Design a protein around this ligand. Structure first.
Ligand SMILES: NC(=O)c1ccc[n+]([C@@H]2O[C@H](COP(=O)([O-])OP(=O)(O)OC[C@H]3O[C@@H](n4cnc5c(N)ncnc54)[C@H](OP(=O)(O)O)[C@@H]3O)[C@@H](O)[C@H]2O)c1
Lengths: 145, 1003, 96, 49, 97, 97
């Protein structure tokens, strides 16, 4: 938790992240524990759910934040869920045994739609709407049978 | 028997030695049990059980990260205003401003400046509101950067209001007082007293932003509230002075000092910076709780005790600290039984012991010993175990606690830092009756006023006797709330816990602290109650007048309804009666919301259109998981909200096999819906929560390892084998020829095998010097894991028994995650991908850190013990076999297959591989993610590497399973192992748009 | 209880307080229960309580003062509870 | 000793039955003595006696 | 490893009590934890060691050997040693071959 | 070590688990020799691992994440895998040979 905070903090400092704009830390493993190889995948799923909701879950086991972490001015450690007015991007970081470091950045899907025309977008919206209805149909049939 | 006796005698073996020792110890047991029985008969069970220790140093929880909580509080306020949850008329805005100012530091100010300066006021009215409030709060925080934090309560004062409805239900409600809308006006009301106590501008509730702008401004008090105290009127709150005769009487001068302090507190706030306080009896709903909140708001360092130390209680105090803990404040929460003399001494030793010795290294400034238990319906003749125990808590152990502090201070030569003891005195000295030894406890505390002068502890302790008035809502007084409006009609005062706390916090102001150092202080906080003659009878009359009115109205309304029913029949009330709709769970897939093009066009820059190669933009189109909280949907509800919706509860009940669907005849009648999986009884969706939620929460998430989920693995009884050299030949045993020859091959001369000619079986005779293995059990100290919910079953999802029997369990987590990720992508038939892409263009880049560890156990351990293991177990172990089964059962691609192994970073390595596979043109769609299982062997080794938290150490610290995983915390001490899988479906954006699949994110 | 200041209050003082307060209340309670079990409402027992002017004035007497001052609740409890017909309260403040 | 063991087994005599009962009661004694010790530490000798 | 003599263990229920053997207190208590009523352990007061007495009905494992029919492999040349290349004994002792 | 030696209460180094991981060999390479902070993508591909390695290395270099990539594969022979490849009848039976 110290190395990861220090790493994120150094990335933010080097890239000139604004003073007073810490990244909000999410610590999903407070709830799930550490499933080894699945760890990043659960975090990525979380990240996607954060992006699409704007809801930043709090670390409800963050009783007392380690005072050593106060030096990391670009990190904030929430204990409670924050309903934001939007999250644009999420960083996912992983540190495996055997020097396996990783980072993924996920960007809010609405930034894709500025790349296309209104007709392409509207065609897509209609297709997705139809697919979603068919998926609900499939899901409830599958669940109950 | 005679031959055995002769040999016993030759060998000098006393055969009866053990039965003789046994009968001596059985007599010792009966003697000890008689002593215990006698003490139980003398003290009673309540007392004997009651004096059990609770305190341990390792359970002490320290809260000090106010530097972090300030920023959280700001961001919460910021979003609450933006979302319209807090308006410019809410006092909560002002209260949060005060708590943010109390934590003002340079980092907080930069934080606020960034958030407020980057607020776009044109986005709406709420944005303009947050921008204006935020700019004012910044100015406040700059002014108080180097100022001591203050206790300053701005909550609306609440009066009691009892209501009896037409049908004789009694509603007790705390209602805003008309005359008293701030604490400054409360102090004015207290100063003026009432006719019964006669012997012979602000923007609150209209503009919170204006009220916030006023908060740093130390208001000058021209004429003190004490000058307004009428001649020959005793204020509702006053100090008393001991007369030369030895009576305690109202003292105008002392009372003026106290009331002026309260007035200053109410305008300017009071600091408690550098006060070290022990408080007992500060649970939720207590007076002490409100005292605690003020002390933390004023920067105190506080030890708070609890007799109910639990996760719920530590989370309660955490939320108090995070909201009210000012800069320099600290909250220490300790389990404590004030009924235990050992706890009292241990607690005080802990407080005074050096940090090196594991103590706090504190010296107390104040002791607030408010621990109490209710004694109700206990008259003189009923005084028994409970009352004796209550009297130990409320008197004896208060004296012992004071004594302990005196001994600690005197042992260290501290003669110039006395601890102020705020004694919870009562006007109730046997006036109400039925309260056991309550009155005796409270009256006995009054000796301390004289003992302060007569003994040798005055330099270590000061005495502040608070005579606490009628305080609504507490453990001791909640049973008396209904009559309080009536009592106040006498021109007398009852108190909220907030007001009483404010009154008591007035005793910790520098002026009262100095007064108690000169001589004991007696503070009457009784709200004129003493001037109501024959109080008990007065309260019993108000109670009857209310209960009689309730019961009469109930009876008269029931009979008037029955009369109307008889005269007008069923047709009159059938058309009046109305149908209730109970909700059914409608589980949603939570596809992303698509905005109108015009809105979506405003977020990205205009130049972005046509700029990107959308074949090189990777999107996530679907995701799923199987983990300790079920699916991605249920885990998100628990993560984000801490509780399940109706949809989440029904999903979890289905996942866990609690409920099953039923369509057809059920006990004659046709039924469509959920039934209990065991009983087959119908279950309404609305009842799933009451019926199953407790079970769902107990058998989900991080919890004690369940042996039934891990092939009977029991960490408390871990099976090992120990090699032993046979010292003497074993009794022959029978084996087949085949097996006998395998024994002979192994042992050679250390075994003899002989055909039994009759049966064709073989005798096997292990000889002296042969090697055996004897099972032995080890207690392992990792007892807890994040386990998939008890009752999860791949068959619930549709996976056949043939697959279940073939594959490692990890493979079932993956197969479920993959189908669920495809459903989250709206792809219900994976072969639909092949309408859009070649079979060469669908990849699997998911992986695992360890793979099919149950299959590894099979080949390394089960095979060695000659247990039945499938012949192809090895293949089910391979990290890439899960992806092979996915392809073989579901996808049928001929696309890339790049299986990463990256331990804890596998899932991110997966995404990196999937991304690069798609950008290289090898795939257009890639299954990415990760999976791992929990089993005995890996748990043991992560324990030997000390990577995981030791559960026994956690239990010593009073941690429950739900709090063992506490990232970024001071006391974090290793990870909590879990199991499961996660999967995403990634694709080229161009293809996601053409297919019309949901897009959850851009990688 | 001699030479027992606040900080020395221990086993002896708790025991003394049981004798001098708690078990006086229990004794009164027992008499009340015996009289009430037999329907005796017209023959109250006068309890002569050994009260003291010493409420922590001398010091060093353990829980003596607490025992003696606590007996003064009985003056109010006589009115507030249901034992007045079985017991009467006579508080003797005993001098030097 | 071996002959005594064989006879003990023929007779279905558990030779260790008494030492086994003894060690169960010795644990019961220590549990009761801990309860008494705890009450003495809470009330003190003066009070308990 | 000798494919001609592959070591397995076979679970056998003790039909008759074993000769007592000596074990440390720690080990004796691990035997007792495993076997419960199927074992008796007794302090030997002189030495502080424990007698362990496995009783009728207790589970034992008896080594047995299987002849396996894969006798040949492509093996790195006999005498290959990482030290010949320069790898230290500390690395050799830490890592899998 | 962790499945069998630990079960027989044999001496096994406390960090045996880490030495089992497929990616630990690459970690030791980096820790003893290379000291890079470059990509680390450890494939598992049974008999095709080394070709999967090359495909990953190639794509890592073409993506611009690396300019140099250590590619290849490794595996050991031990009793247990030999036995299981025999139970799957994948290997030649020496006695039939
Ligand atoms: N009107 C009034 O309420 C009034 C009037 C005059 C005087 N007082 C006095 O004010 C003080 C507080 O009154 P209150 O009404 O706030 O009482 P309360 O709400 O009953 O609170 C007392 C707290 O003591 C704790 N406690 C219980 N048993 C304990 C034990 N064995 N060891 C440690 N703590 C224990 C409980 O908190 P946990 O559950 O956290 O352990 C309980 O909530 C008392 O001494 C009372 O006599 C009250």
């Amino acid at each position: 938790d110290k190395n990861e905070s220090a790493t994120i903090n150094e990335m933010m400092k080097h890239l000139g992240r604004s003073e007073g704009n810490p990244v909000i830390g999410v610590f999903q493993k407070f709830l799930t524990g550490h499933p080894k190889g699945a760890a990043g995948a659960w975090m990525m799923n979380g990240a996607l759910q954060i992006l699409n909701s704007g809801i930043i879950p709090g670390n409800r086991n963050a009783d007392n934040v380690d005072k050593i972490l106060e030096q990391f001015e670009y990190v904030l450690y929430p204990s409670k869920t924050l309903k934001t007015d939007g999250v644009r991007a999420v960083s996912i970081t992983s540190f495996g045994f055997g020097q396996k470091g990783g980072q993924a950045i996920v960007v809010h899907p609405d930034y894709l739609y500025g790349a296309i025309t209104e007709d392409r977008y509207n065609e897509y919206v209609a297709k997705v709407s139809a697919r979603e209805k068919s998926a609900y149909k499939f899901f409830h049939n599958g669940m109950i049978y | 028997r005679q031959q055995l006796q002769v040999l016993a005698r030759y060998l000098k073996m006393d055969l009866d030695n053990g039965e003789r020792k046994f009968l001596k110890e059985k007599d010792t047991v009966a003697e000890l049990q008689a002593q215990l029985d006698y003490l139980n008969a003398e003290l009673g069970e309540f007392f004997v059980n009651g004096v059990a220790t609770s305190f341990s140093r390792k359970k002490a929880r320290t809260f000090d990260s106010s530097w972090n909580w300030a920023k959280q509080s700001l961001l919460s306020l910021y979003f609450e205003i933006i979302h319209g949850v807090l308006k410019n008329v809410d006092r909560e805005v002002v209260s949060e401003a005060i708590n943010i100012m109390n934590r003002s530091n340079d980092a907080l100010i930069k934080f606020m400046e960034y958030h407020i300066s980057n607020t776009d006021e044109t986005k709406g009215e709420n944005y303009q509101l947050v921008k204006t409030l935020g700019e004012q709060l910044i100015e406040n925080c700059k002014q108080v950067l180097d100022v001591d934090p203050v206790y300053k309560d701005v909550a609306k004062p609440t009066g009691p209001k009892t209501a009896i409805d037409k049908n004789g239900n009694i509603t007790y409600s705390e209602e805003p007082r008309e005359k008293v809308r701030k604490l400054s006006q409360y102090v004015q009301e207290m100063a003026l007293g009432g006719p019964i106590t006669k012997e012979s501008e602000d923007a609150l509730d209209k503009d919170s932003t204006k009220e916030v702008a006023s908060l740093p401004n130390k208001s000058t008090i021209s004429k003190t509230v004490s000058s307004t105290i009428p001649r020959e009127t005793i204020p509702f709150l006053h100090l008393r002075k001991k007369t030369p005769a030895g009576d305690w009487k109202y003292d105008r001068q002392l009372s003026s000092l106290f009331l002026d302090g309260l007035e200053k507190a109410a305008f300017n706030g009071v600091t408690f910076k550098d006060k070290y306080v022990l408080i007992t009896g500060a649970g939720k709903g207590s007076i002490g709780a409100e005292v605690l909140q003020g002390l933390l708001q004023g920067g105190a360092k506080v030890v708070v005790t609890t007799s109910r130390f639990s996760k719920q209680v530590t989370d309660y105090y955490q939320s108090i600290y995070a909201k009210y803990g000012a800069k320099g404040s600290t909250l220490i929460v300790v389990p404590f039984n004030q009924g235990s003399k050992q706890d009292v001494e241990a607690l005080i030793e802990f407080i005074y012991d050096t940090e090196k010795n594991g103590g706090l290294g504190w010296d107390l400034d104040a002791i607030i010993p408010f621990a109490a238990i209710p004694e109700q319906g206990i008259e003189l003749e009923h005084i028994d175990s409970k009352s004796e125990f209550a009297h130990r808590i409320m008197l004896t152990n208060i004296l012992r606690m004071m004594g302990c502090v005196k001994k600690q201070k005197s042992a260290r030569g501290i003669e110039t830092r006395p601890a102020q003891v705020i004694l919870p005195m009562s006007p109730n000295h046997g006036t109400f009756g039925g309260d056991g030894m309550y009155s005796e406890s409270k009256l006995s505390l009054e000796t301390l006023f004289n003992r302060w002068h007569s003994e040798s502890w005055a330099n270590q302790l000061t005495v502040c006797g608070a005579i606490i008035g009628w305080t609504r809502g507490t453990g001791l007084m909640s049973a008396n709330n209904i009559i309080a409006e009536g009592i106040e009609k006498m021109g007398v005062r009852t108190f909220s816990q907030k007001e009483m706390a404010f009154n008591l916090l007035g005793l910790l102001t520098p002026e009262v602290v100095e007064l108690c150092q000169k001589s004991p202080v007696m503070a009457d906080l009784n709200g004129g109650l003493q001037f109501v003659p024959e109080l008990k009878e007065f309260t019993a009359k108000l109670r009857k007048e209310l209960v009689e009115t309730s019961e009469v109205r109930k009876a008269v309304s029931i009979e008037t309804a029955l009369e109307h029913k008889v005269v007008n029949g069923n047709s009159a009330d059938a058309a009046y009666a109305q149908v209730e709709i109970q909700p059914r769970a409608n589980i949603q897939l939570d596809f992303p919301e698509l905005k109108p093009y015009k809105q979506v066009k405003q977020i990205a820059p205009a130049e972005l259109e046509g700029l990107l190669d959308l074949e090189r933009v990777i999107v996530v189109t679907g995701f799923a998981e199987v983990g300790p909280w079920g699916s991605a949907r249920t885990r998100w509800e628990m993560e984000a909200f801490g509780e399940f919706s109706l949809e989440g509860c029904v999903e979890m009940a289905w996942i866990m096999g609690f409920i099953s669907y039923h369509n057809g005849n059920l006990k004659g009648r046709p039924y469509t819906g959920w039934v209990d999986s065991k009983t087959k009884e119908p279950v309404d969706d609305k009842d799933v929560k009451a019926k199953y939620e407790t079970s769902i929460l107990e058998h989900s998430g991080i919890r004690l390892i369940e042996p039934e989920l891990f092939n009977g693995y029991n960490p408390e009884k871990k099976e090992m084998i120990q090699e032993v050299i046979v010292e003497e030949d074993l009794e022959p045993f029978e084996a087949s020829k085949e097996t006998a020859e395998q024994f002979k091959h192994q042992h050679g001369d250390k075994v003899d095998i002989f055909e039994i000619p009759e049966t064709g079986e073989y005798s096997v005779k292990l000889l002296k010097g042969a090697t055996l293995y004897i099972p032995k059990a080890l207690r392992f100290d990792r007892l807890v894991a994040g386990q998939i919910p008890t009752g999860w079953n791949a068959k619930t999802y549709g996976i056949s028994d043939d697959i279940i029997s073939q594959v490692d369990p990890i493979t079932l987590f993956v197969l479920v995650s993959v189908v669920e990720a495809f459903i989250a992508s709206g792809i219900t038939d994976p072969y639909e991908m092949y309408k859009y892409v070649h079979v060469s263009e669908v990849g699997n880049c998911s992986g695992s850190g360890m793979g099919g560890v149950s299959a590894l156990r099979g080949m390394f351990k089960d095979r060695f013990k000659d247990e039945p293991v499938q012949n192809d177990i090895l293949q089910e172990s391979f990290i890439n076999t899960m992806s092979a089964w996915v392809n073989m059962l579901l996808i049928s691609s001929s696309g890339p297959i790049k299986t990463p192994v990256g331990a804890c970073a596998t899932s991110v390595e997966s995404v990196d591989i999937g991304v690069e596979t798609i950008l290289s043109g090898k795939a257009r769609i890639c299954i990415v993610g990760g999976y791992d299982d929990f089993q005995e062997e890996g748990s043991f080794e992560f324990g030997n590497m000390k990577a995981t938290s030791n559960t026994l150490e956690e239990f010593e610290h009073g941690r429950t399973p739900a709090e063992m995983s506490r990232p970024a915390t001071t006391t974090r001490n290793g990870f909590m192992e879990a199991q499961g899988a996660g999967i995403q479906i990634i694709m080229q954006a161009d293809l996601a748009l053409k297919m019309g699949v949901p897009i959850y994110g851009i990688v």
